[PDB]
């Protein structure tokens, strides 16, 4: 009741009944229902002094009675704003020491799991702080150890996937590895859980970063996956980042003049995009080439058609197809004496509803041909089919 009394008035009155619930559940060791309300108020932004003090006071008693997920989460909420990364690392090391003291040995029933997953989350947050500490190499090594542990734990039960993938995404963003950030963020979004979707603004910024990386990523040449994903619902309506959504739509469609105007206006929004403007123009050219190949069809092409459909001169089409073949978009072969660019298997695209009917009709024709051939074969050689 002592520290309970001290923390009772060190907050807002709206949070005071929560303190009463914490005190009531502490009386008869109902600490799981206490942790429910602890999570209830910890997620709320009102807990800025509470994250600083209530954790280190309350949970110091109940840290060895509750599932370690909530225990580590309560400390994580505290370290969402602090710039005490030295003492934050010391806090994480203390958490490791306590978990490797209780779960070290003397395991005698009482359920439990030795709570290795909490240790994995703690190490992931150590890597996160190291990234905040500009420990890029050390953070990378730590997350390598984390993925090694991910190989263990016999297909780990989610949760740790969220923190680990978020940590790798943050590392790739800080290292400006656009393709790695894109893939890791997509994996994290797929592995996201419905227990909490953190701050809507933070997830909006994450979607913004994902769009930036997709636009500035090398091994990405189809933005359909991002556009029709629930991650885009965060800025499916906002106008502050509507410019990049329009630019992505132009990228997919292949618009040139609209792309030029949008890139001119928004080149000053971030210097990161201004640095890689030429890469974005090459992305436009490759978009146009792929869409023209997929629309005009024809296993062959011509230099003039590519030049007209990509706005590049008839002398730079060759390098364009060089990049296209090297990046894996196509598997063709050039011919310059007579400009007759030859095209083979093309990068696959998501199939729409209309394409199903044509493929179904072609299937029907193929199956009818096969049936006719089989009927002829059976009829002709019935004397030996035994």
């Amino acid at each position: 009741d002592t520290i309970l009394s001290t923390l009772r008035m060190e907050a807002d009155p709206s949070l005071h009944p929560l303190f009463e619930q914490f005190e009531k559940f502490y009386e008869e060791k109902l600490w799981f229902q206490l942790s429910e309300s602890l999570t209830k108020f910890f997620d709320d932004a009102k807990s800025t002094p509470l994250r600083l003090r209530l954790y280190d006071n309350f949970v110091s008693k109940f840290y060895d009675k509750i599932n370690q997920l909530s225990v580590v989460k309560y400390l994580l909420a505290s370290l969402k704003d602090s710039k005490d990364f030295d003492e934050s690392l010391k806090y994480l090391d203390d958490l490791k020491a306590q978990f490797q003291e209780l779960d070290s040995k003397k395991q005698r029933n009482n359920g439990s799991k030795d709570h290795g997953d909490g240790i994995l989350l703690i190490d992931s947050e150590i890597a996160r702080t190291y990234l905040l500490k500009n420990d890029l190499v050390k953070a990378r090594d730590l997350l390598d150890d984390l993925e090694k542990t991910l190989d263990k734990k016999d297909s780990i039960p989610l949760r740790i996937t969220n923190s680990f993938y978020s940590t790798n995404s943050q590392y790739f963003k800080f290292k400006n590895d656009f393709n790695s950030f894109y893939y890791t963020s997509l994996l994290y979004l797929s592995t996201l859980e419905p227990s909490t979707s953190i701050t809507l603004a933070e997830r909006q910024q994450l979607a913004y970063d994902l769009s930036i990386s997709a636009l500035l990523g090398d091994k990405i040449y189809n933005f359909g996956e991002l556009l029709h994903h629930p991650i885009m619902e965060t800025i499916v309506n906002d106008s502050n980042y509507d410019w990049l959504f329009q630019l992505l739509n132009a990228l997919t469609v292949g618009d040139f003049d609209k792309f030029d105007s949008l890139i001119k206006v928004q080149i000053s929004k971030i210097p990161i995009l201004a640095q890689h403007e030429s890469f974005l123009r090459q992305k436009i050219c490759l978009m146009t080439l792929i869409e023209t190949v997929f629309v005009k069809n024809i296993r062959m092409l011509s230099f003039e058609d590519i030049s007209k459909a990509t706005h590049l001169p008839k002398d730079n089409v060759e390098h364009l197809v060089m990049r296209a073949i090297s990046l894996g978009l196509l598997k063709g072969s050039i011919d310059q004496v007579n400009e007759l660019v030859t095209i083979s298997w093309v990068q696959p695209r998501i199939i729409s509803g209309d394409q199903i009917t044509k493929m179904k009709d072609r299937l029907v024709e193929w199956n009818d041909q096969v049936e006719k051939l089989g009927k002829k074969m059976e009829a002709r050689g019935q004397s030996i089919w035994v």
Binding site: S155, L187, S190, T191, L192, E225, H229
Partner: protein, 169 residues
Amino acid sequence: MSLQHEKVTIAPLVLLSALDHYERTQTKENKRCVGVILGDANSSTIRVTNSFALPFEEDEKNSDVWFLDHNYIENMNEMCKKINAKEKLIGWYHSGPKLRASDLKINELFKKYTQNNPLLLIVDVKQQGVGLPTDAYVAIEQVKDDGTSTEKTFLHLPCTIEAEEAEEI
């Protein structure tokens, strides 16, 4: 984790034991029959060699009301080891006719008894098929085809019926 799901080989004895099991317990329609698929593994080609009956029970209701005896698996294991120590549990089979809802759920029960990933063997015991009535389904985790959370689901494997010297005769 072992990747051994490239090829599956079944001796005819496992399959005929499946048919005998189905015709023995008088299973009517909608009543699936399940047993264990004792064999040898740890190589690329998983090989099924011997089987036995299991007291699997399930009401045609909520998929979680499935019941299966835990002691029977180990009790059969001990006797079969006494008869032959070269045959180890490598999963389970059900008496067809096609994949059901609880297949993913019940497979996890055999995770501890098995050493590698448990093997599912569908047996067209009532013989509606035209080709081979057997197909393998190893439960593996891969990303969703709809761009959603990674799912631990079954994967079809090329199963070929092949006999040894003892059973070919």
